[PDB]
Design a protein around this ligand. Structure first.
Ligand SMILES: [Cl-]
Ligand code: NA
Length: 536
């Protein structure tokens, strides 16, 4: 592999490459969706615009009808035409096979009509405009001719080695420590979009230690890093490394990191106690100690600071109902609630005099989160709440998170950048969590509020900015008053690059793509990174 034609990339491969199944992207090699399999649209979160990808055009032609026109001349990597039949298949297979992740689409999509050879009309029983935006960017189109013979379990359990997609790269080889993608010189995007991927190969590397990753970046052996790497601010200063911003906070935001609270456990069940905890926490201590100013603290509502979300920011609500670091306020609230240190041991007991302690947890070995929860636990101890950090192995953390068996838990899985603010509120408030044993979609502390469910549905079912702004204000007001989740900071969209070989990376001063190749991000313009870089 000629060095100046090969891009070495790390930050998303954490186990030996073994799965490339577009139906299970959470288990697939990162890039499966983006490099190999493609969506109808991209969403540009920097400019708050959709970009027709496989689709030439898509629009709502009535309240419950969405007309999609596919581009002409699309082909699968095996030379078979990609047509509207493959799109129909991609949706209808999930009607048949309910174990497919997006099978619930059929609860609100009624039918798909064939308008002409490349045009489909989606006829909705319940037009969920916000949720539809997420379908448009996150559902990969798959080839009927490859998947149509399979049973449900064959579909869901397939490793899908040598995946046949439509995208700009295919898998050439793999090993325990890498997946090698090779440029598809026939990619339809070259002729149809005028986009030409620059690397002939992309080598996706698994790197076992942060010392090796940072060392490789310094030596120009790793071109593109989506790893969290401590010390980047000093290394930039001393040695030179590309980041999105020249100064703090260095990185774009990826999601809202915060504390989910078990609202069904006394005294966490008292909304004012939750508010006291929020006043007690100093997010700037996390920004400095855990992240060396590579993140920013969140606004109290936790709304990501990107244009598609901020055009709905409820400033008057936040001004009135927000919180901030103020330990004296925290103590005042606790005193009013009757949580006083009667045993004289430095910890407040409950108003009946009964001692209690709480845990806060994050996964073992996730060092930045460990520092962060240690910092949180200290701040809470400082206002007399007995909190101890715990660091369960990942599988126990995940059982605690999804099962709801925690007191306080640090998480950011459902609050990522997306094509709609609805996904943030849904990830914080996910009403069905209250009724299921396990929730994977948010509201892990199982907060129940009928007004929230009504409002989230009104948000989903609106396509009107004025109404959306109103709904977002009411949702934010409830989040701030009841705090089942306490937003703390925006975790970074970690990006560093070496210019040893490749240059012209996207940055704040040349912001032509979001340079993140984690799963979910190719469709947020990560793919466009590959059209702009150039080899020295
Ligand atoms: Cl549903
Ligand atoms: Na006490």
């Amino acid at each position: 592999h000629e060095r100046n034609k090969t891009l070495y990339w790390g930050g998303a491969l954490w186990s030996p490459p073994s799965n490339w199944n577009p139906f299970t992207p959470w288990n697939a090699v990162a890039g499966t969706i983006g490099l190999v399999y493609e969506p109808l649209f991209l969403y540009d979160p920097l400019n708050d615009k959709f970009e027709p990808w496989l689709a030439e055009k898509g629009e709502w032609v009535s309240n419950n009808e969405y007309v999609l026109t596919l581009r002409k001349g699309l082909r699968w990597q095996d030379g078979v035409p990609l047509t509207a039949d493959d799109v129909v298949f991609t949706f209808e297979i999930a009607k048949k096979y309910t174990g497919i992740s997006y099978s619930p689409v059929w609860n609100w999509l009624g039918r798909i009509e064939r308008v002409d050879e490349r045009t489909l009309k989606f006829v909705f029983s319940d037009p969920r405009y916000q949720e539809w935006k997420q379908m448009l960017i996150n559902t990969p189109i798959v080839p009927k001719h490859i998947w149509e013979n399979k049973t449900e379990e064959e579909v869901l359990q397939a490793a899908n080695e040598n995946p046949v997609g439509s995208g700009p790269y295919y898998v050439e080889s793999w090993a325990d420590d890498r997946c090698v993608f090779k440029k598809n010189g026939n990619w339809w995007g070259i002729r149809e979009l005028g986009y030409d991927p620059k690397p002939e190969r992309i080598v996706e590397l698994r790197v076992l230690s942060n010392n090796v990753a940072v060392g490789m970046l310094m030596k120009g052996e790793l071109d593109w890093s989506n790893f969290f790497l401590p010390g980047v601010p000093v290394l930039k200063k001393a040695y030179g490394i590309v980041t999105w911003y020249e100064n703090a906070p260095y990185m774009l935001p990826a999601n809202t990191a915060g504390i989910y609270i078990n609202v069904n456990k006394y005294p966490l069940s008292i909304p004012e106690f939750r508010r006291a905890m929020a006043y007690a926490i100093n997010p700037e201590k996390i920004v400095t100690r855990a992240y060396e100013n590579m993140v920013t603290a969140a606004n109290p509502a936790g709304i990501l600071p990107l244009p598609g979300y901020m055009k709905y920011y409820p400033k008057e609500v936040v001004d009135k109902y927000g919180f901030k670091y103020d330990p004296e306020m925290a103590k005042k609230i606790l005193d009013e609630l009757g949580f006083k240190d009667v045993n004289k041991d430095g910890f407040r007991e409950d108003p009946n005099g009964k001692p209690f302690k709480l845990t806060i947890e994050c996964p073992y070995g996730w060092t930045d989160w460990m520092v962060s929860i240690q910092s949180i636990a200290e701040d809470l101890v400082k206002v007399g709440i007995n909190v101890e950090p715990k660091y369960p192995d990942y599988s126990k953390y995940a059982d605690d998170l999804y099962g709801g068996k925690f007191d306080l838990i640090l998480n950011n899985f459902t609050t990522g950048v997306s094509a709609t603010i609805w996904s943030y509120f849904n990830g914080v408030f996910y009403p069905d969590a209250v009724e299921s044993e396990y929730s994977y979609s948010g509201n892990f502390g199982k907060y129940a509020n009928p007004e929230v469910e009504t409002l989230l549905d009104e948000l989903n079912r609106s396509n009107d900015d004025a109404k959306i702004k109103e709904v977002v204000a009411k949702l934010s007001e409830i989040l701030l008053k009841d705090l089942p989740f306490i937003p703390l900071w925006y975790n970074g969209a970690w990006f560093q690059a070496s210019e040893a070989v490749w240059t012209n990376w996207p940055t704040e001063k040349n912001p032509y793509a979001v340079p993140i190749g984690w799963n979910g991000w190719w469709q947020l313009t990560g793919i466009k990174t590959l059209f702009g870089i150039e080899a020295k």
